[PDB]
Amino acid sequence: EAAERNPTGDNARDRLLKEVLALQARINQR
Amino acid sequence: ADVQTIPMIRGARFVALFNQKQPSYFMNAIVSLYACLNGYLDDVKVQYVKFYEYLLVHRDLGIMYGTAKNKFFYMYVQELNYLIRFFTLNSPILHGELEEMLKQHTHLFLQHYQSKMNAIKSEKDVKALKNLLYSCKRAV
Amino acid sequence: SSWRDHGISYLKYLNVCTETLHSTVKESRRAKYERWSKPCYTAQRPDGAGGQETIDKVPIHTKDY
Amino acid sequence: HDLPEGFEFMEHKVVNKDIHAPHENLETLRLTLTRQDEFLLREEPVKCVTVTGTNGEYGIYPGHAYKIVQLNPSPLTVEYTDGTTKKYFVSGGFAHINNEGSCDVNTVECTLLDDLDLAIAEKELAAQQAALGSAKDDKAKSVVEIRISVIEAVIAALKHH
Amino acid sequence: VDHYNVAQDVVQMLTKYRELQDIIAVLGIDELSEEDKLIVDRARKLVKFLSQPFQVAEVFTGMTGHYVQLDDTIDSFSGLLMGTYDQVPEMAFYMVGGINSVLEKAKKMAEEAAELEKMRRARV
Amino acid sequence: VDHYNVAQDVVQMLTKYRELQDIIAVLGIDELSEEDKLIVDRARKLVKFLSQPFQVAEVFTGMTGHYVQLDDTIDSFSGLLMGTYDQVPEMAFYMVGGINSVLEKAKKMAEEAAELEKMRRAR
Amino acid sequence: SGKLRLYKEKLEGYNRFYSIVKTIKMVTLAKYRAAQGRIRTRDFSLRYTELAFSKPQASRDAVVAAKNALVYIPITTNRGSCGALNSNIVRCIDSVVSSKMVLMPVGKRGIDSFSKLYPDEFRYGIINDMKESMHFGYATFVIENAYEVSKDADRYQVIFNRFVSAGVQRNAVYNIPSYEKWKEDLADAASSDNQKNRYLFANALQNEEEQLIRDFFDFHAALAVLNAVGENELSEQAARLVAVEGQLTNISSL
Numbered sequence A: 001e002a003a004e005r006n007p008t009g010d011n012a013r014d015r016l017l018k019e020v021l022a023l024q025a026r027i028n029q030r
Numbered sequence B: 001a002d003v004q005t006i007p008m009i010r011g012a013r014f015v016a017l018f019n020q021k022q023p024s025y026f027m028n029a030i031v032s033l034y035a036c037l038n039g040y041l042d043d044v045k046v047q048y049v050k051f052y053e054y055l056l057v058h059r060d061l062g063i064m065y066g067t068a069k070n071k072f073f074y075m076y077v078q079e080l081n082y083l084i085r086f087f088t089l090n091s092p093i094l095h096g097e098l099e100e101m102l103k104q105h106t107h108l109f110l111q112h113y114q115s116k117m118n119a120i121k122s123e124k125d126v127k128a129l130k131n132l133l134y135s136c137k138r139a140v
Numbered sequence C: 001s002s003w004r005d006h007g008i009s010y011l012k013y014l015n016v017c018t019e020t021l022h023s024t025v026k027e028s029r030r031a032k033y034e035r036w037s038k039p040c041y042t043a044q045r046p047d048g049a050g051g052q053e054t055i056d057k058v059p060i061h062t063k064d065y
Numbered sequence D: 001h002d003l004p005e006g007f008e009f010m011e012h013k014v015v016n017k018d019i020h021a022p023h024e025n026l027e028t029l030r031l032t033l034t035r036q037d038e039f040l041l042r043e044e045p046v047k048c049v050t051v052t053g054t055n056g057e058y059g060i061y062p063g064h065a066y067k068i069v070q071l072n073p074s075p076l077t078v079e080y081t082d083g084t085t086k087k088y089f090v091s092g093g094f095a096h097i098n099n100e101g102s103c104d105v106n107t108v109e110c111t112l113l114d115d116l117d118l119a120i121a122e123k124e125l126a127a128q129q130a131a132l133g134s135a136k137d138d139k140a141k142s143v144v145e146i147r148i149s150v151i152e153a154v155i156a157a158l159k160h161h
Numbered sequence E: 001v002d003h004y005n006v007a008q009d010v011v012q013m014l015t016k017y018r019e020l021q022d023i024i025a026v027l028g029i030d031e032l033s034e035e036d037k038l039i040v041d042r043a044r045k046l047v048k049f050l051s052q053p054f055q056v057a058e059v060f061t062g063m064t065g066h067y068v069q070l071d072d073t074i075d076s077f078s079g080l081l082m083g084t085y086d087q088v089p090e091m092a093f094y095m096v097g098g099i100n101s102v103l104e105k106a107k108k109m110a111e112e113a114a115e116l117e118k119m120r121r122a123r124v
Numbered sequence F: 001v002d003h004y005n006v007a008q009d010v011v012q013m014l015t016k017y018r019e020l021q022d023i024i025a026v027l028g029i030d031e032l033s034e035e036d037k038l039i040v041d042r043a044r045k046l047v048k049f050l051s052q053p054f055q056v057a058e059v060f061t062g063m064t065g066h067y068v069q070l071d072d073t074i075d076s077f078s079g080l081l082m083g084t085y086d087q088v089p090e091m092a093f094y095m096v097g098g099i100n101s102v103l104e105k106a107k108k109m110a111e112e113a114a115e116l117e118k119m120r121r122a123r
Numbered sequence G: 001s002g003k004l005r006l007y008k009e010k011l012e013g014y015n016r017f018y019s020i021v022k023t024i025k026m027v028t029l030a031k032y033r034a035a036q037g038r039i040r041t042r043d044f045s046l047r048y049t050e051l052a053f054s055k056p057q058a059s060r061d062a063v064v065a066a067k068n069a070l071v072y073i074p075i076t077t078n079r080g081s082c083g084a085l086n087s088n089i090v091r092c093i094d095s096v097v098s099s100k101m102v103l104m105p106v107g108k109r110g111i112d113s114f115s116k117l118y119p120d121e122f123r124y125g126i127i128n129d130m131k132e133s134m135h136f137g138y139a140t141f142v143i144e145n146a147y148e149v150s151k152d153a154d155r156y157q158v159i160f161n162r163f164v165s166a167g168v169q170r171n172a173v174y175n176i177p178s179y180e181k182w183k184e185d186l187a188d189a190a191s192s193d194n195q196k197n198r199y200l201f202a203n204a205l206q207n208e209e210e211q212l213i214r215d216f217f218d219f220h221a222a223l224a225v226l227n228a229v230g231e232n233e234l235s236e237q238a239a240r241l242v243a244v245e246g247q248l249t250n251i252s253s254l
């Protein structure tokens, strides 16, 4: 509670990895 | 070449203790080998043997937590190297204090360090622990 | 008949009946038939040490029923 | 990803007759006698089959009503249209009778009555009787009673003929 | 320090994989332990990942060359060692640059596989 | 005659064990027949029973050496070949002298194993 | 020299290995042929078992709908060198991962493979020594252990290998729902015009007592398990020949 009161390159890799995982999951579905 | 028996539990830790980058002082090496030989590292994971040895040599957990009752036998007293070489570790003069120090160090290490090390899941903390262990491999 | 009241299931009853029937077979043919009733199955779980801890959930032999 | 079902590899399905259909006069019954996923007869045409169920004996002839029978350790007779009788002995199982002219008898163990012997049954019966008195508990008594009943049925089947 | 640690880990993985290859080439992959299979998969991905198309060999490779930065290489190999890329196909690491190229190739392969699966399903 | 027969039997058993080692490596000990498992056990005991601590290598080994009499060796190996010591633990034949030393080491092994079991029992 | 003798010894060892593997191939082919007799005697025991349990159903609703334990009983071989059967079974299990999944695998390889991959979804495994013929008692043991693992289980999915031909070993599934769900479906088939193919079967079962119905359920479940293990053994022997042939080719190349 007190923590709440008080208050990019790596993101691209995470975004690409999430997209790849989503595609690999989608293909398995149908 | 062919069941975690005592020989197999201690052989792996002995092999882990043989990794070095710089020559080791006789007192530190003999004390670490004696500790690993008498089962004081059975509860310590193989990955953490080097960190345990570094804390034993370059730190004193008993003094840090105020539980050290030994009179003379401390790892920071470098002059004990020749006393050990003269009398041996398995002598009444040094054996009692050596066992007391090893027991205290094992207890404090396990409790205050291995519990936290086994509770790390965050990627940042995992990477920090991995770097710490690698540095320990090249520090003692 | 009276085995149901004691909790013995139907499958164990079938196994007992088959074992008795095989025991009643002639000497010559039994060599084949006995191969269809000899228990050779066990339940195991791997422990930390590696030993195969044997389970007692179900009896293996008929005498243990 | 959709795994098959082991029943798709078996093309010898079960023919179930529809409710509102004409009747047919059948002269043969398709028998299917099975032991431990193994058949002795494959849709064999027979005149009749006699099976000893729990309630009592059943004489199945072509056109018998759809029924399920829980068999008991007992003989099983098969009489062909030629006039030949073949006798087995079963230890348990089920018999499914279909109004379309089929009888599937699935038994745990179905062995020829000839393969069985008399003296062996007598000695086993004596041993079971002796062990009954020394039964460890109620469960052992019930098990020994089961075995004794099976042996008595075998002996009766042998002595009948 | 990170460069040294990553390089040492890669060398250890390659050494262990080379040791396992002796057993693999005789009996087979299926005759390994559960964790040995994981080591084999990671080492195969490492071996594929080490390849790179040069800007001078475009004629022979038929692909645009790559120039991988030192930091990018360290980060990509460190990530691969941790196992965060276990889902990525093995061939995604073959003849690419940094990790971003690996992910882009994996995305293209996933799209092609999805198209093939859609074509097969529609055939029903 | 006894010495010659015992020596020939030992050599033949060792050769047979060497042959069976390949099958063990490919198939496994569990796959061998009971007739072969007995040979394997006896051959292993023979291999370990051939080792001996020398009185001049005490520094290398850290144990007192043994001087085995000729008759004692023949009797011990003859007994081992025919299975008189099939129930003795395999390690009891390692770095010992005659048969008496084997029995003493087996007794010591049993005592320490019992102590370990007692320690485990208390836990 | 020594290096020449080193290569000579290595070649001799490879020759010994090749001979041993050839003997293994012969032994396996003997049992393949010896237990090839099943093919004539199969595909007729499970006829009303189809009516009891055969149901064309979706692979999602049956999975998501259940909120109780989903028991799985993969069939796996004791000895390796079979081929890709165990790997494919593991892949099928992995595709069906759920919070309700419970594993009671069969065979040493299955235990050793599902213990590490799925520690919290693994209770214990069954092992049979391939000394006797796969009989009803073994199937009853498996079923009893499966019930005791999770008695309040939505279903019991058996995954095994179907030996279509000498070179074709597919993966097949037997689904064994809980007694309550089976009773509900049976009543619906008996009453409603739907499930017209099981109408007579369901009505025949209803007319009888409940103990008989339960015995029928258990008996046919055991038969399905027996069929699964038998087909898995035959596929293992055949599948094993492929692996042994591959090993022989590798040894010859070496």
Ligand SMILES: O=c1ccn([C@@H]2O[C@H](COP(=O)(O)OP(=O)(O)OP(=O)(O)O)[C@@H](O)[C@H]2O)c(=O)[nH]1
Binding pocket: D055, D056, G207, G208, G209
């Ligand atoms: O109180 C009862 C009522 C009925 N039942 C059981 O319900 C079933 C009704 O069965 P049916 O009444 O439909 O057939 P059936 O005359 O041919 O009976 P069986 O000779 O084959 O047994 C029979 O199997 C009967 O034994 C009981 O066991 N107890």
